[PDB]
Amino acid sequence: GAMGDILIVWAKDVDEMLKQVEILRRLGAKQIAVESSDWRILQEALKKGGDILIVNGGGMTITFRGDDLEALLKAAIEMIKQALKFGATITLSLDGNDLNINITGVPEQVRKELAKEAERLAKEFGITVTRTGGGDVDEMLKQVEILRRLGAKQIAVHSDDWRILQEALKK
């Protein structure tokens, strides 16, 4: 199209991913790359005819959920400060009662610490939290090979995510 070749659709839920693709296809979108921490969502993207994927190999998605946006923001702000200080790249967006946080570029131990901190903040601010993705480098390698077997043509990795995974592989 006039604005580009590929739209990037981010998802942490397979049904929300399919809803977003349908909206964009109705607006005349053609090629769609799906970005997700959930390997199953990337597999669904391939099943439905996508072949460009963006992974979260070493990181995870944290989703705070609640009626009170000010409570979600208080929890997210503590996650932002801690994650940034450890050298993370963090992406935030609102979707109804969800505040979605995609985290990359921290070692596995630090990400597990952040996941535990998310659970503590959820309890502190009277909200719920879900984790999407979060695995080790061997699982990342295994799941990338599965995506290729299922017909992925282009798999993209955030450079900070890749550098963390390469460091984990050397160890």
Next chain:
Amino acid sequence: GAMGDILIVWAKDVDEMLKQVEILRRLGAKQIAVESSDWRILQEALKKGGDILIVNGGGMTITFRGDDLEALLKAAIEMIKQALKFGATITLSLDGNDLNINITGVPEQVRKELAKEAERLAKEFGITVTRTGGGDVDEMLKQVEILRRLGAKQIAVHSDDWRILQEALKK
């Protein structure tokens, strides 16, 4: 490679982009997609042999700079709350004394408001701020065509960015 085909490198400075590419190439990285709000950085990516680009068509990058990280975080947190409430996707990362904020998925008027708010917060917290990118839909279309003339093979747009730009084109 074993972890994927493409690394995504984000940049708001052309020299930092080239530094990151060299680091990754030394670690054995091959294909690199460059993501930037600055069309000149995307043009440099093509000049140096890249052909995959990720734009920020309707959004912008805001960079707070200062010695006091707690001051940068105070300014960034006000930007996060305001941008999220308007329906933005925001990506944050630290790089030395810079706090980088990539904003997509808000209409042009709201983005201009956020840019003015960034200038006010910089003054309030005794830090500096720079804007990278930020243009209208006609400029976006013009610059995408220039990237294609300069040999771009795949141009990706965030779906929220694309939906804002499509809405601006209908108007």
